[PDB]
Symmetry: D2
Subunit: 457 residues, 4 copies
Amino acid sequence: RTPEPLILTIFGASGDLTQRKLVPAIYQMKRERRLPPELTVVGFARRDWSHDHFREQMRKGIEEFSTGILFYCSGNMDDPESYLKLTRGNRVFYLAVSPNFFPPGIKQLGAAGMLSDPVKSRIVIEKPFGRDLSSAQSLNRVVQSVCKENQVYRIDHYLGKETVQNLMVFRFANAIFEPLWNRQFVDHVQITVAETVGVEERAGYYESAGALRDMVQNHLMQLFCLTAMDPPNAIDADSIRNEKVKVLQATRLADINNLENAGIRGQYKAGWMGGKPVPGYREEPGVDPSSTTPTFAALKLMVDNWRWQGVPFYLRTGKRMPKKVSEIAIQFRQVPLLIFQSANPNVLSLRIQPNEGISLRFEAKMPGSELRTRTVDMDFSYGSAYHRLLLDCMLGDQTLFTRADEVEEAWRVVTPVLSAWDAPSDPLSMPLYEAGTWEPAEAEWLINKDGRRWRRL
Amino acid sequence: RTPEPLILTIFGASGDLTQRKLVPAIYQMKRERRLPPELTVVGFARRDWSHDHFREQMRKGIEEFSTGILFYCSGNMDDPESYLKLTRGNRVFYLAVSPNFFPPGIKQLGAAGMLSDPVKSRIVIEKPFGRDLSSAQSLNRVVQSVCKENQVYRIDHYLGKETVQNLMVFRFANAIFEPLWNRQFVDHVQITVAETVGVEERAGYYESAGALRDMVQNHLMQLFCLTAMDPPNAIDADSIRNEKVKVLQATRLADINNLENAGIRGQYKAGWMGGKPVPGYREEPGVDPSSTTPTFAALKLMVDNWRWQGVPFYLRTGKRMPKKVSEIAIQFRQVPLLIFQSANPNVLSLRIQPNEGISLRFEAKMPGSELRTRTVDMDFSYGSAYHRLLLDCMLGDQTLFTRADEVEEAWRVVTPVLSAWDAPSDPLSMPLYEAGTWEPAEAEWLINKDGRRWRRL
Amino acid sequence: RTPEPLILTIFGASGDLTQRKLVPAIYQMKRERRLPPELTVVGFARRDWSHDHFREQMRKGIEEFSTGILFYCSGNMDDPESYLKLTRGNRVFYLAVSPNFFPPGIKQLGAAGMLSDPVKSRIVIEKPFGRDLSSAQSLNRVVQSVCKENQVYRIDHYLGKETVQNLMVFRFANAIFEPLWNRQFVDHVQITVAETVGVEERAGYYESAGALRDMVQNHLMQLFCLTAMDPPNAIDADSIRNEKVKVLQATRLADINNLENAGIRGQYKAGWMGGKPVPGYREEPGVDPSSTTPTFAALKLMVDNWRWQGVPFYLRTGKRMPKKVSEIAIQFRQVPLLIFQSANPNVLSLRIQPNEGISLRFEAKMPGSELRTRTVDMDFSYGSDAYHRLLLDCMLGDQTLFTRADEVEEAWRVVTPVLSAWDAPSDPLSMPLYEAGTWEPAEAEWLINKDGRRWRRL
Amino acid sequence: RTPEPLILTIFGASGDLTQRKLVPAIYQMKRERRLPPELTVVGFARRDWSHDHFREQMRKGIEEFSTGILFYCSGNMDDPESYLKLTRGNRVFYLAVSPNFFPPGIKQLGAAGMLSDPVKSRIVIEKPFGRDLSSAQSLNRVVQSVCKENQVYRIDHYLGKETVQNLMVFRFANAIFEPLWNRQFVDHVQITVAETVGVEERAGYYESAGALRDMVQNHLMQLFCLTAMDPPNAIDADSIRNEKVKVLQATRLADINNLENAGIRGQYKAGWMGGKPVPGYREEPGVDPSSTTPTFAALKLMVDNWRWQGVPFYLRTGKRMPKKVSEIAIQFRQVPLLIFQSANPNVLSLRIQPNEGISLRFEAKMPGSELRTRTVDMDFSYGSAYHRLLLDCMLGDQTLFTRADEVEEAWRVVTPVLSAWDAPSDPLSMPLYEAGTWEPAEAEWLINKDGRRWRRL
């Protein structure tokens, strides 16, 4: 709502990410009576140009990727004093640079003295943020010596402003669901995120990422905290992150000694997708013919407090799955009686990605003259990316950006399975599944051993 | 299921209510291959006809009022020698003569000696069964000295074997709705039975009954017992009736010193119904032009035990209402935290007469950018008389017929209002209402003074 | 407070079970103005005596077994025609003969019309009442064809009516103990009845009973029903029996298929009890030198309803144990969290035979710089005959100390699988013997230790 | 737990508090094997006598006060130049001169650069810390502009370390007391702190302090926060304060509009105490003979969350009460079924001041032949000031010292009451009570109008 006028600058040379995506996003929101006309988006890169030789570059991508129809200070990074060469006195910095450029790029910026104000300047950083627990802790120390915890924005994932608020109003404004969210009535919970695309062109990035560093830490660890936290005192941005952090300090893997009851991996083979054949992962361009690089990942978690004792959590994600979905399923206990010999347990679902809504399933009597029960259903549908982030940066509200406290608390949970999986091994014992199959056969025994089974989505 | 050969001895099957109703029902039951082809019907009345007259009367009654295409013996009712004049030996009697001829008939039939077989003879009694607590108690003594416990069937109301069983499975086979069925989460309950037609040709009977002996004691007191009972150990006939009695022994009117916070009566006058004008109750034929008989009744009860303490119950019934419905509505409390703005409390209703199914209401976020809530709905439909009464009497089912303990226990709670409303008073202080209006204006203040409102159907 | 005038007809065989046990009680309480002196005791037996010989015999025992300082009838039991021609019209009957006689002695009583009144005749019976499920139903059928429901009194275990009312007030008058009395907070329950005496001199009744028809069915099944029943509407006599019956219909033995996880038996041998060399079981007079009658018995039951689902119950009883106690112990769950600074479960007990009182154990911090925990407790004590009160209530009618006809047949059903298996002949060298002075036969310890628990030391 | 060696820099030691009270405590600690042998104490004052005259004030302050049997300077107070005249590299300051010299002293001490690294020096501030909400927020800004947290310790009151741990272990290590600690079973809570002494010689301080700024913001707020707080994740210095702050953000005075149902005040007069006459408040030296300072206060608060919704809290404190007692009492509800005759509700107490322990009252049957209940009791006793405060500062701990958030949050709650009693009024409207009487007669209607009574300690 009416962001204050400021000046924006860019880093990281002239990569196509900003010009084709970020610049059109600002232009699109400009013609909507949202941003003030006084913006003066100052450009900056690592290549010689002129003030007019790059103005047409914006038009080269705006109409080529969007609906269609500014000062250049290019210098030289290879000098320890280049920053000295560089409205209402406001600034916003961008760090669209290589992963190995942040510690160089923040130290000299702090030494310059531009980031010496609490309100005028802010700095944002690009994903990823470290590669393990040790690498993130060291990077957090450099940030703390140049800035405060009010001007740093980390872009890890985008869940949506309207998706978080839809869940908070459902649990905390109804007197019929909260008493049932505890260990006395719930049996187990399941979380699933599915995809139908393989690595298309990002073969150079996914090779060193895997499926635990890509989606498990960022995405599935944020849907898990929303369905297991305590009621906050307010919806204020810093009143929810405290409750989200508090629940991450009681979370642990189910088994630590034997890392086979709390984790499986996989990698997809050749198969049939959408009526056409598709190649295997190892035969794709840019991929080494003998690599592990997990694509599937299933984990089991436990929480130790007065509310969630004895209730396990199951997390599943992967690529080349039959369909694209995202869901949370809560299953209750069996009825404490048997006068109805005939009773399947009750399930409450929360659909997210395909069609937002709420479902509830229970048991009803089958018409006739003999006591038999069936299963019925109830439904409710609400309907019947970069645009939101930049607005929140301009206003200055930080609820889509993770704090520096919970970044290092999610790296600690997945530490054992990680350190087990980066260890080199024989490139012939990796479980495989066809492109179009829900899961490898090894992941079916993880849940079936407890007497349960996965959900057919 | 299959009945057994026997013989009927319907008393006074010459006047009415037998030739046009009982005989067609038995004929249609036999036509559908339900009753075994070994059955005899014998009339017993104060007439001097022959068999052929009975056959022609039965044929005329069946053809006139049903789809279409046995002996007789005269007898008196005031002489022991008369009964001396009167398959496999089984016998089932039927007493439908008059509301003054039950005790002589029962006493003489018991004295003569036909009703002396525990497993071979049964007796049924027509509605009503007594008029006060003392009048009902006296009739039980005569029955107790001539009859056994499993030989008496009392016909007062009809609910159907499918409506009772559809409600037991929903409650006791689900692990969600039982924890919320107590005083810690429920606010109040409401029960409503409405009708659109009243006193067509039964002005003689309705003058001495009123809407307290006609519907409140029989019908509305059986829907109230199923909503407040404890889970039984089985679905046996004896296992369920033992939990309905235990609830009626802890029920009392809310106010006993002042009979104005726990009871309201009314009567209907001229108005518009179905686009046509209708006459008033006092100007209807066969009715005294200064009558003081109520066609409306609202009460408030309280149950005092470990589960239903502090939760009131509201009961309402009447005639010439705008609609024909029957419902039970359970409303829950309000959420403690007020961090949300607009919060209507949740409700859960079970429709019966209007439609059979379940209704639910909760709160969901209004789309946009401001925190506003909007109430939504969930639905489920199951679909999309005097014929089962005669079937369960042939076999041994103690469910559709009330016991001897509930009859004298339902007459006790309504005693304070029965005595006060029966005393003579001037015929100018009755709260009249129009034909087509939900309730008298005096009934609005009974619930409004507590901070609530009558549900609008 | 005071009963009504009546006429009594005690004695059925003129044995040594009434002269020094029953009539002294009436005489003793006649001196305290408890009941009016408007009764005439009538003696009925198969022997021939005089009106003074009976009085002399009664005096021979009244002063020799009590505090010290009655028309007799003769004939035969099988021919009561002469006896029929004997205060208002009130009678109370008594039976003190062999079990095989109850049907002969109760079938002919109703034939003569002596029992043709609702509230003027009582037909109290001795113990036992049947020997198995099928034998009790047959006796119930004969009773139902002569007398009414509120006319039959069955002599059984004695609780005193003061212990029963002590638990009802404790449970149902406090708003601090009922919320925790369900499956969400309780781990398991234990019930124990101990004794320090052998078979004494009977040796003829215990040889055909064992410790399954002697204490388990009668005594231990009534302490179990009071601990697992739902609140009643009133403290009325017939309003508590309904709740007691409703619990026995959902009770079953765990592991019915394999009868080794739900029952152990035992017998005691020679040992030291009070510094003396107590002899073994198969050495006392009147006992066969090779017998397989149980003396110890442990069982495990499980209730299946909305409140007690998943909570097991443990029952233990025996003879020649080191001390005489009776107790009920309730153990709660562990705290759903671990104390953290960089825990034994709580028990609630209820003593009966050893002492009438309450106990409660919890955890407190140890004094010092560290935060180690202790096990502190809190206490409370109430204080800090049988055939004299069980007999004086038949004159007025109790309906509380005497069991009904439903629970009698319902308690015989749960213990049926273990009663049949233990009756089949078996090698008389595999009985789990134990020393006279120890608790368990060392094979009942694995019954509970297998689940991860332990018996209470007591 | 041995403190690290350091150099003490006591500020303003010329007063009658350091050498009389603080120095003997340090001496006694040094006699034991706790304090390190390398501890240098530096004296600061306003006057200049000699370098050895400071060593003779010790002889008159220790040899005759505690147990029987070092530098100096003459720096100014407000002068930048004067501070230039001023083991290991460790120091600890002790600022206690007056309640109006904290800002300039702190500013001039921080200007010289004596606080420039995380852990080399600590500053402790003597009570009081602010007078109103506005006067306490400004002092926090000055502190944050010179140093950071973890380096400042505020002395407000003294609650023993054993008492807090004794309270925490009892609540959170038992499985029978937590389920009953919520709104479904509790009626109300009472907290009481009583004394038996007057103003003594501190007539100059109590005149401008009152009974609202003493023991109602410091003492009674800490006892209230330990009873209404949620279980912490782990027992830690900064894990209990987070849960204590979260509770103070929900409390509020009941009936804010009318400040007479949420607060009473009083003042004592002449009476009998220990068999000896005692003077009234306005008859003692140094007190104005027409003062309106309260020596009594009773409040009523309410917490608004999912746990304490609808449960009031009653706070009471005063002077010249008959006995010295501190206690917390919790009273539960009444049993629904009323088939038992007399049922007083159960109470659970926690004695603190006279002797620590636990009590519990319940109902047992009175022996006899008729049904009548009794009241019994169960007990447990644990046994059967300026010493630790001078140790946690040297060792380094933040458990006995309040935080910055809690100081400004306790001042907000009592703001409406504080701002109303401060207004001028006629001296003849002050409630009065005798010296030896519990409460003024006006304070007995605050609780009796709800159908309750104060406890009879």
